[PDB]
């Protein structure tokens, strides 16, 4: 019925972070997730999207994350790893059904990275 | 040889019948499916079959 | 919702972007298309995007 978008804390360059995007539904392996990126004030892009048998990262993302399911939860969380302060975004997640077009858009968590 | 020469002849101006416009882009029909849209180029299929 | 320059563009038998790739209606279709501005209402100053 609804998605919550929580995580997002404050690391640093290089490190790991575990974001969930915990769904409110039955059904939520099959809506498939789609990870977007917005710039702190600039244009909005994507990220990736685990859509069941394979996966589709970004050209910033290529490769350095590991995307994964939790098909027996019906949640969806993304692997960060090789972190960049050039990354620092507000992630986000959506999932649309097959059947009769609906959005279960979220909220969004902060991707802050220091640099040293 | 007059009844010949009309059954000819009607047959004749049947068959270049099929070489006019009627009003269409074209007298071709493929040439009208080919470089209109099908959603309008029903009125040009009309016009020729009319 | 969609862009503003394509309600004019959602109608049957009318080629573009978003009716050929979203939302293609029959050539054959009888109803009746509705829209209205919603400017207030969904944009949003940060940028709804």
């Known amino acids: 019925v609804q998605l919550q978008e929580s995580g997002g804390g404050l690391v640093q360059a290089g490190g790991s972070l575990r974001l969930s995007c915990v769904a409110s539904?039955?059904?939520?392996?099959?809506?498939?997730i789609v990870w977007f990126r917005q710039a702190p004030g600039k244009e909005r892009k994507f990220v990736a999207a685990?859509?069941?048998?394979?996966?589709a990262y970004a050209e910033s993302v290529k490769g350095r994350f590991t995307i994964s399911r939790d098909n027996a939860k019906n949640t969806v969380h993304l692997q960060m790893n090789s972190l960049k302060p050039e990354d620092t975004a507000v992630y986000y997640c959506?999932?649309?059904?097959?059947?009769?077009?609906?959005?279960?858009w979220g909220k969004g968590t902060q991707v802050t990275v220091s640099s040293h | 040889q007059d009844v010949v020469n009309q059954n000819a002849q009607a047959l004749n101006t049947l068959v270049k019948q099929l070489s006019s416009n009627f009003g269409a882009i074209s007298s071709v029909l493929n040439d009208i499916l080919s470089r209109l849209d099908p959603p309008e180029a029903e009125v040009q299929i009309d016009r020729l079959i009319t | 919702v969609i862009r503003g320059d394509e309600v004019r563009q959602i109608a049957p038998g009318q080629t573009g972007k978003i009716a050929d790739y979203n939302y293609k209606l029959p050539d054959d279709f009888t109803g009746c298309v509705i829209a209205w501005n919603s400017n207030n209402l969904d944009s949003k100053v940060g940028g709804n995007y």
């Open positions: 959506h999932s649309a059904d097959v059947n009769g077009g609906m959005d279960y």
């Open positions: 539904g039955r059904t939520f392996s099959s809506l498939n």
């Open positions: 685990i859509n069941d048998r394979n996966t």
